[PDB]
Amino acid sequence: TRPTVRPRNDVAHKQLSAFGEYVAEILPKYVQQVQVSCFNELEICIHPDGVIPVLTFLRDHSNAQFKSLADLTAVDIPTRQNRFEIVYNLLSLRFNSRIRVKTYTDELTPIESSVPVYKAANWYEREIWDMFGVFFANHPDLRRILTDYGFEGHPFRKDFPLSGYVELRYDDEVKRVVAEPVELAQEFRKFDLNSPWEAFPAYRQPPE
Amino acid sequence: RFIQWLRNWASGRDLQAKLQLRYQEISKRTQPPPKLPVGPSHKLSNNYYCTRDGRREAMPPSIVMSSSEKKAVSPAPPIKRWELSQDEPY
Amino acid sequence: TSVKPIFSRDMNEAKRRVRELYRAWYREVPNTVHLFQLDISVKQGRDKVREMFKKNAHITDPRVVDLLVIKGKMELEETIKVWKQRTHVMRFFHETEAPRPKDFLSKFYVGHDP
Amino acid sequence: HPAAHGVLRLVMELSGEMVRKCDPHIGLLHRGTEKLIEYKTYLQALPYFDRLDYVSMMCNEQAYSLAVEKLLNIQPPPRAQWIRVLFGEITRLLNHIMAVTTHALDIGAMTPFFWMFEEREKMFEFYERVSGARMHAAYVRPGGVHQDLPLGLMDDIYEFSKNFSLRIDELEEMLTNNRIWRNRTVDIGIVTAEDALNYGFSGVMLRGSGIQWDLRKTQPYDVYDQVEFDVPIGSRGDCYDRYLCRVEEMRQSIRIISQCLNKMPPGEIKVDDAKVSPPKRAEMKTSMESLIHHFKLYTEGYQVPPGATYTAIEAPKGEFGVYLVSDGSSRPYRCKIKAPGFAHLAGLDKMSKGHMLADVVAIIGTQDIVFGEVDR
Amino acid sequence: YRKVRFVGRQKEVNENFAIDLIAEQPVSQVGSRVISCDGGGGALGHPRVYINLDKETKTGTCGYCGLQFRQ
Amino acid sequence: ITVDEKLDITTITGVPEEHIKTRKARIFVPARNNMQSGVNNTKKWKMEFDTRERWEN
Amino acid sequence: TYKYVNLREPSMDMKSVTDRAAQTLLWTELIRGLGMTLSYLFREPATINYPFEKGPLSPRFRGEHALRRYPSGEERCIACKLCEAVCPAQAITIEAEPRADGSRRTTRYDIDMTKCIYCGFCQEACPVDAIVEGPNFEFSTETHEELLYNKEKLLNNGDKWEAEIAANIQADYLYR
Amino acid sequence: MELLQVLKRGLQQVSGHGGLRGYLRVLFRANDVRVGTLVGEDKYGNKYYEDNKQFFGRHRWVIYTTEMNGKNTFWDVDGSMVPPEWHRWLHCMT
Amino acid sequence: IPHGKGGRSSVSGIVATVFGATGFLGRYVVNHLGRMGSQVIVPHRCEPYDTMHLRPMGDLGQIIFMDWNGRDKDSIRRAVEHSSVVINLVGREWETQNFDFEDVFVKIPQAIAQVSKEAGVEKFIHISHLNADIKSSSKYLRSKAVGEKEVRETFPEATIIKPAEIFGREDRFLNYFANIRWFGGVPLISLGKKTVKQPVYIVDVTKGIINAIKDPDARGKTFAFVGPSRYLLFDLVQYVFAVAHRIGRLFEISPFEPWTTRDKVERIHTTDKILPHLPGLEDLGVEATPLELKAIEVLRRHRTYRWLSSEIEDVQPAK
Amino acid sequence: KKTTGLVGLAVCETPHERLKILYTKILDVLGHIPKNAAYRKYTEQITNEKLSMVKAEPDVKKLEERLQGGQIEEVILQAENELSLARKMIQWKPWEPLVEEPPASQWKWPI
Amino acid sequence: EYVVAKLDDLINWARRSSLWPMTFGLACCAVEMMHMAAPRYDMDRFGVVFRASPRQSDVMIVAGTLTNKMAPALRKVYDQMPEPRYVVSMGSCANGGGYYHYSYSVVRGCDRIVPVDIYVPGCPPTAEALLYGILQLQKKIKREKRLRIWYR
Ligand SMILES: NC(=O)c1ccc[n+]([C@@H]2O[C@H](COP(=O)([O-])OP(=O)(O)OC[C@H]3O[C@@H](n4cnc5c(N)ncnc54)[C@H](OP(=O)(O)O)[C@@H]3O)[C@@H](O)[C@H]2O)c1
Ligand code: SF4
Ligand code: SF4
Ligand code: SF4
Ligand SMILES: [Zn+2]
Known part of the structure; x- marks a missing residue:
């Protein structure tokens, strides 16, 4: 359009269009939506039964290696009727390309863990257990990482209010370092910044 | 002096790139008042929004998803190898 | 209910699993009372455990009971070993915290409707 | 103490004299980071990426500003790209001074710590003259550099950077052809297989063992293609x-x-x-x-369109990735950080078995572990 | 009830006040209709605002400027 | 397989402390801060909780 | 591209082995190495003698807070509520009131000096150019009850100098 | 023969600066013993010397004297006694 | 007036003023007032450093420190001006080589029964002991009875407290025993006739006060603290060696802080179990603590692990 | 050569006939997958174009071009593990049609 | 008298002639302390030698940020220190916690665990306002142990 606006290219917008066309053509048991990101990236929606095989198809092949697990993460979403969102991410070292694996889930429904396929996701899966409560099945070592020994909230989800319940202190009443109910010395003001007029017309929701 | 060349028989010899810049060749200050221009389509009668449009670009274009002699095309052409950078590669 | 379970199937392997780990905790009360050098009476540590299991008996569903197992299974790693430095164990015994009124008229003198 | 100053409690069921089992404990500095960026705006939550490493100052915020410009469809202007490289390739003379000195202080050499930090203070001078402050500078923004650098800094970087190759010619004679330090470090912690890529490692503890690859000349950042160098x-x-x-x-x-x-x-x-x-x-x-547009860009923030993204730069020990889901209004949704220390330290338990206990302190220094970045 | 925190602490408080230090200004006169006050010097002080001075005759200290301004 | 169909009401417990029975939530549609006239502030059902004491420090 | 380091075999002949067997046995390294590189003590030490000498700084430095005022006083603040909306750490606490003359001012103004994360976001959000990060790191009080600042500390702390501050801002307002 | 080649400069530097009393009086506070080249003017009696441009960082040294506003004789120097004008000078800010 | 939860950082209405508050009895009181939260103005005599472990009790601006000699009037008339209650626990053991020890329990509780009384305070509280009797014992035990009598003239309603003998955590009473690793264990005086007293637990005496500090209607009604179950024997000294298995002083040592070859050997064995018509602890409810539960903790010598506790006492008789 | 580039691999030993065994080792397995899958339809195509370039031409270096694996020992390992994928590919059935559509509003991002 | 109060012109001078700091380098204020041991503003040999062991130290210096999982390990280490001990907190996170004052996993202030003497404010204080911090600590030592045993 002008300077200070990002120039795109149609090369990678056509190749990454054409490449992952046949990842839905040759495993149509699991893959249920594929969409191309406008900034030349790929997302591929996978039913949670296909957590191990579509990785295992990728893990070794001649046409799509994807041998580096960069980032396993997890997002929680109320109002979805299935809460969470597990997002895998991989790296084709032979090819310089990215693809993300977005598998939805719920709390009580377990997920078959990707420990045997990648040994990178040993610590990326003990962590998500602590922060949301997703129970990854048959994990070789499931423990308590990044939290204290007394938290029972799984705090990175939307039901845990920002400051905790267990604000700590010391007393000389015996020797110990003891807990207490939470007691702030300031309100933590909550500002309101969401301004009207619906500035974005392209992403507009259907009218209803 | 005798303490000068004793530093020249040991650990090479520099005498110019001393550690402290406390000696000369140290910059004192700067004089002038700075003036900074404003260039990229700041002016008028052509330079103009709705041609400048740094935002408002469409959603990610989805491909065929649910609800032919393809030659097994890779995501990209594979990485060609590198040189060995002739400065002193060994 | 179309979702696979964790360990149990229906009401019987679950309610023998919860009776299994109680025999672990009943054995591993009088060990930590000297393994941390904490000076109370040993019957206090057994009263807290038989208090704690009766709390959750309103469940009419499997794999919720199995979720509480995993928490109960995990604590025997830290407690039977030495990973809590005398202080994370003693938080179950609210010694410092003042007593709550829990009767109507004593709330009315102190506190705007807790 | 004397192992990251006061962190990293680890258990070692040492097999007689060898270790053969080692499993550390993190979470002594957790602080609640990713919970807390959900309640801020974009410009306001920028100085919690600067504090996410310790020693990289302009290398972080280089991978936050670049992960928000993508969502905006805006490129930085041309002078704003040759500033970011002059700083993003001057913090790679700070993260590598520390990894070659504090490593060699845990081993026990005294002076090259003191010999380099006496010289290093010529270079924390340069942050103060440009941004305003000593280490944590809120300088890079999601639209390029904040403000212009003063009259100077080109007769003072040039006097500095023409005389740094002698200071790096001292460590070659301290360490490289030294015998005792070569004896303390040869053939130790040889993890080299494709289990050294199945673990998902980023750079060095890759390319220093085999596989030639880095994201500076297989992907672009900036006007960064227009320089020449070898890896x-x-x-x-x-x-x-x-x-x-x-x-x-x-x-x-x-x-x-x-x-x-x-x-x-x-x-x-x-x-x-x-x-x-x-x-x-x-x-x-x-x-x-x-x-x-000055007032309302400081009560509320920008407005950025929805849709996720991911990126990666070459942080001077590994990567630095952001998975920044933005909903469509001034306060963002989840902001997941990828940093080293998840890869670089899950792969110590493989790396340590068979060797002594005094080999283990020799292992950890080469990964250049900086805590608060294990808050990924 | 509250005053015990500065027993032997000298209670350091402000000395000059600008609650009313406006009034010592020789309120400026022009003989015009509208005047600018980017008061305090250019590129510093409050932004430029145009005041109507026609009552019988004052301006109102610009809202920002504080200094009594008139004709 | 082992899909074990049944029906039992999903209720979870243990995570908060005592604020289950003490606090009644409130679901509402927000309605247009009337000093302006833009209607993007609507269109989302929210929830919000009770207010309690705020003393002075 | 590439570069290979530590990829070289030894010579392994009759000559150069004596060159290496003079190293291990009679120490042609480790004395020529570091009995000479260390001493080299004969440089002048660089120590700032702190109670008297002080170190260099720069006119955009960040530090203690202040509130300026105009020529003959007006308390340059106007309580426009922006320096409190972009503190990332929520330190500022402003409560205005219509003052009796008609121009609006503050009543209470509170800056914690512990939640202050030292951005420079108050310094640059202000339209009327009042609250300025002043260039003096003199601090170190002995009570947490003290580092909470009021309004009538900052003015005193902002009129202990303005010859210091106004020499700085006049040099540096031309960039921003 | 540098034992007298450069001590001849130091002989007038050490001895002939304030005699016998003016030398050890500054020696008992620190090893800051070099007489500076130039002088400052301000303010009380504390002539803030400025050196011969043969240093950097240690080229703007100050002296304190006695009891600014209720202090001891010389054995309490805290460093915050300076006037708020030398902050523009002592810190090399201009 | 109160507000909110009384966990920390609340207001709770009261503004105490606790004199002493450095020793074993005075310190442990202030800990329970640095919880419910209140302006506990604590003045101290001559100790800048020895009071430093008291500061993480008052939240932020709760407590405040002043210096005061005690004999001078206005140094104790400057802190008592803004107050609600004021309790007293000042005093010591043996006569010092500078003070006179006689009027220190007479004029000095009266020096803070001065214009302090006039200025508008209420609920002024003094302390007593269960053995302070005007019959001919002792130089310390009587002349405390002067403080029971000669200071009662002013403030005709106080609720002066009369606690029992205390065993605690950092005390001197029980700790005077088992510190007798020495050339012999000599009891007083090779007899077990009237041993033992009522060792009340120090958490109860500091819980009696804070239930009396807003009781209400407890003025003039003096109280006497019940001890444990129930009397005790000479078996105590055998029980101390059963589980044990055999501030601001100076720079190097204080050469005189002794074990007092004087009245102190018989300042504790004069028992005098006093009037059981005093109300005196259970009505100042609710607290009743034994000895055999809290006996493991404060007794601590070189075994440090192996206790194997089974030592007990029947009641003893006259229970 | 003695260095195989990537440390962890080894030059042992024979190129040009270690490969052509392992292609046709899989082609026997590749015939077994019940042919209506697109998996056979592509994987048969990628091995035949490979081996027609492979068998049988010097040098060792020329096989690296036109078959874009890495060095020759690693080109073995691209095909060595595709066998280990292939016998797993019979076990589960990717060629069968789709199972358990998500409940019609899950992949709609701006809420 | 003049005999006894003269003796605390030596002991209260010996106690301030050599402090031996423990430090808790936890977060970003560790590095901006290490530049003070770097020979520009050289910490040692202005009286105060650097880091030692927990049994031998006088005056500890808290830095960084105290979470929940470091709160007992601080107080245990504070116990082992001798009787003339002092606590300095540097950093703006041991003063009420920087930011992360509102997030769940931070002990909000580090005075809630130990009694701390000299507060030094600033995200990283510039090792220039920390020598001014410790030169406030030496000026704090004007106390005497004489006229305590000699008054009462
Ligand atoms: N109820 C009981 O069972 C019992 C048992 C024994 C003693 N007492 C007496 O009841 C109170 C309990 O005190 P305690 O157990 O904590 O022991 P304590 O050592 O007497 O502490 C009381 C405080 O009073 C201070 N003090 C002594 N003389 C003073 C004076 N002229 N002026 C100001 N302060 C003076 C003491 O030293 P400082 O001046 O340095 O502060 C001490 O800090 C004391 O009065 C004690 O004599 C009661
Ligand atoms: S300085 Fe500016 S932002 Fe701050 S109160 Fe004054 S007018 Fe408002
Ligand atoms: S420096 Fe930043 S955080 Fe501190 S008061 Fe100013 S705006 Fe707020
Ligand atoms: S807030 Fe201050 S103390 Fe905390 S990590 Fe950042 S710079 Fe260090
Ligand atoms: Zn004006």
């Missing part, structure tokens, strides 16, 4: 030849600085279209249209 590789797979990347990269960073002084175009700094950059102080004080 040092290692021969065998141990600590002494992933040490030698860090000595050799510091010589190659002088080449990318001396190539950067010649090329800076005069011009603007901020992104011009004013829905992202604030305007000048002499501009919001005469005209009318400038307050409405």
